[PDB]
Amino acid sequence: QEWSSTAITDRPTVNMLGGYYSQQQFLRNLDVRSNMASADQPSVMDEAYKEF
Amino acid sequence: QEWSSTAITDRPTVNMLGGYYSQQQFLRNLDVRSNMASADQPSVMDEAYKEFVMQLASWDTRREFWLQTDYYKQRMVGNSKADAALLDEMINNIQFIPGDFTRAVNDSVKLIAETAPDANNLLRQYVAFASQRAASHLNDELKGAWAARTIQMKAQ
Amino acid sequence: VMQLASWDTRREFWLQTDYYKQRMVGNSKADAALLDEMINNIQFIPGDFTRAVNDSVKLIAETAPDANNLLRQYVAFASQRAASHLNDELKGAWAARTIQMKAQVKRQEEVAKAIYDRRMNSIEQALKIAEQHNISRSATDVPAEELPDSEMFLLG
Amino acid sequence: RPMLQAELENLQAVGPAFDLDYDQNRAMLNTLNVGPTLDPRFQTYRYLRTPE
């Protein structure tokens, strides 16, 4: 029969990142006081969508 | 008959963002005061228009607009397969053409109906529907960011 | 430029001109077709800075004086619309700025009041402690009143 | 003994010492606790060509 279905996705939002977003943000602060991290880095939702 | 109507949109003005603009600006202020993230980011109007454009071209937005449009409901024979096929066809009727600033062409949306008054009214209603969905999504995003900022400030 | 190239601007301009009004025949379909035909009679060609060519606008009418006067009036119309939109944007941004400044001033007043109340309480407690221990020497340290709240007891 | 006892009592009464940053953060938290004002039905676009 070979039926097919399609889905199209995009980056998540802060609302459905649960607490995770906040936690990650906390760590990012600890990463900019020390080693300065990167001023221009992808957002938390960008990394989450990359992993997805 | 297959009549067609066209609309061309652009970023909203500051006055039509209501209070939302100001609220968003406030949050941005905090993101500049702590956890440097400005990086000459696009304005609030740019983000609002990006969300609106995302909603306009969305397949789900067209499906949900047609499912409640009172123009699809009239053309329902009661058969599930035929109704699904008609819904798919009318979803494909709405087309979004993104614009690129190189040749000064803006984003456009074209709708196809069976009559000219229908082609006009349905396109107006669909643009309003997409704008309302984008506004609701932006409000939810503002709530989430505000809650996260409040939690961070309480911890600090 | 956005007003110049806008379809809506051309539509309203043609609607408000006597050139279109005198050519109306009273039939809605014919009038709409004529309006659509004359909207396309105004063509905007964006410029290219690489080739040192500027933006241009061309208007087509039925007579040379008409083609001149209508183009002048349309450029004035687009400029007026752009000025009105810019004024609206400026007013909106001004309102946002004054709201933000009012909030900031309120926060500064609240912070100052909190500090003043804390210093009030510290002074009162230091006075009570000094009266309890009969420290009436009026002098115990060389520095001025700019002592920490915990060290304010070193005064009579 | 008298001066030390008076200092002990004064420090006990006054409590911990806070700086200007703490008060500013407290005021900002007070403004954050009222919550955002979510107004729906605000427009996210403008028409360059209205449907006809």
Residue numbers in the entry:
A (entry chain H): 53 to 104
B (entry chain C): 53 to 208
C (entry chain B): 105 to 260
D (entry chain C): 261 to 312
Sentences from the paper on this structure:
The ConSurf analysis also revealed an arginine within α7 (R267) that interacts with the downward facing L4 to be highly conserved. To investigate how robust the alternating conformation of the L4 loops is, we replaced this residue with an alanine and a glutamic acid in two constructs. Although the change of this amino acid is clearly visible in the cryo-EM density map, replacement had little effect on the overall octameric structure of WzzE or the alternating arrangement of the L4 loops. Although there are only small differences between the native WzzE and both R267 variants, these variants do underscore the nature of the alternating loops in WzzE, as both structures of the mutants were solved independently using reference-free ab-initio starting volumes and clearly display the same pattern of alternating L4 loops in their unsymmetrized C1 maps as the native WzzE.
